[PDB]
């Protein structure tokens, strides 16, 4: 039993997204395809079920209207259409199959992420972060770098073309309204900066962007 799901989409606000899920190799059984939304990290919300053989759907009363479940019996292809997408609906959506008796989701698809955003490809602004701020802790200097207002993801950041790889902490991006923002920090010994060069490297392939910010003193 294998389930293939259509991968990521970027939907506009007040729009709809149709999502597919093909079941394979558990031919002849009466089993159901299930859709489960995972809001962010830990809340799983059961959306509904549909039998590809008979057509028996059943929704969670919270999603009826937001979500329309359909199947092409003839292909074993379930569908979920979500309409009037709001920023709030930006989650991962799983497809999984159950098989009689027990009633557990025993086989799961890989997930479908939907980012609901009104942005077109937006290039980031890369800002050096020099710790002038609150003077060195003695032995260590921590430097940062801030990547602001980019759509879609990802950007990639490395320090000194990845020659600097220890004491780097890169923070997950967050959809700052309808754009993303992420940062990273590197901790070097106090003799190193600025006697040695530390440079923030960024490339946002979705917009041809590559930038190098030497964090000048």
């Amino acid at each position: 039993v294998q389930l293939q799901q259509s991968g990521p989409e970027l939907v506009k606000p007040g729009a709809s997204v149709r999502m597919s899920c093909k079941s394979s190799g558990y031919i002849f059984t009466d089993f159901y395809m299930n859709w489960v939304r995972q809001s962010h990290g830990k809340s799983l919300d059961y959306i509904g079920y549909i039998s590809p053989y008979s057509g028996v759907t059943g929704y969670n009363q919270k999603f009826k209207g937001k979500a329309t479940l359909t199947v092409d019996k003839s292909s074993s292809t379930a569908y979920m259409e979500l309409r009037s997408l709001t920023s709030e609906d930006s989650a991962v959506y799983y497809c999984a199959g159950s098989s009689g008796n027990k009633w557990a989701m025993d086989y799961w698809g890989h997930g479908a992420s939907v980012t609901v955003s009104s942005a077109k490809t937006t290039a980031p602004s890369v800002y050096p972060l020099a710790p002038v701020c609150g003077d060195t802790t003695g032995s260590s200097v921590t430097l940062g770098c801030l990547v602001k207002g980019y759509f879609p993801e990802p950007v990639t950041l490395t320090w000194n073309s990845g020659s600097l790889s220890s004491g780097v902490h890169t923070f997950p991006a967050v959809l700052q309204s309808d754009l993303y923002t992420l940062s990273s920090s590197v901790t070097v010994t106090s003799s190193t900066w600025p006697s040695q060069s530390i440079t923030c490297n960024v490339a946002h392939p979705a917009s041809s962007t590559k930038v190098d910010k030497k964090i000048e003193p």
């Binding site: 830990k42 027990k102 989701m105 972060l129 802790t137 921590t142 923070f171 967050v174």
Partner: protein, 218 residues
Amino acid sequence: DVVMTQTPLSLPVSLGDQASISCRSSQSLVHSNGNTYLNWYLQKAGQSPKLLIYKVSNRFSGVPDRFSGSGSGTDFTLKISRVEAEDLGIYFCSQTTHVPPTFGGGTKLEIKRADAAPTVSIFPPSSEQLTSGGASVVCFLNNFYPKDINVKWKIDGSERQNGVLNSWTDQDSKDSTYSMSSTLTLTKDEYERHNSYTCEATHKTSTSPIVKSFNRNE
């Protein structure tokens, strides 16, 4: 809707330890056809959920002997006998007796260690950004343990809210410590007419809030 409440919310273990996760429904799960339909899942790091036990104690295929489930009615437990490293991730409990299916919030298994104190660092907006017309003051609270930390932003004595973007690292696979970032974003105009900026961390290791400050020129 049956609320599935699950405790702990986070369970720190050393590899090799016993672990138990409790889960209670708000109604009995004993169905009319005679069955209590309570299942358990593990979603390891960024993977899909994986069924471990169904109908409270039935181990699914390929799930080892270490993992067990038990209970009745309203009260259930998932037990691990030796937390091997492979087991670390979020476990949820789902009920399928009553409509709709619901799930608990999950119990994050994590590696326990000695409390660390945040290495706070605050960063003034960059020339570049102030030239853009905007100003982010960033504050990295690198490498603390436990993850319950509390960041506040203060500008000139009143506390600050509009403009804080907050994010976080998961347990680093090296030193078991978390790191989180705070960024306050205001106008060049409002930055220029204010002067002390305070990233004021509260962590459970110090009674004393960790305060990194700077003054735009003071």
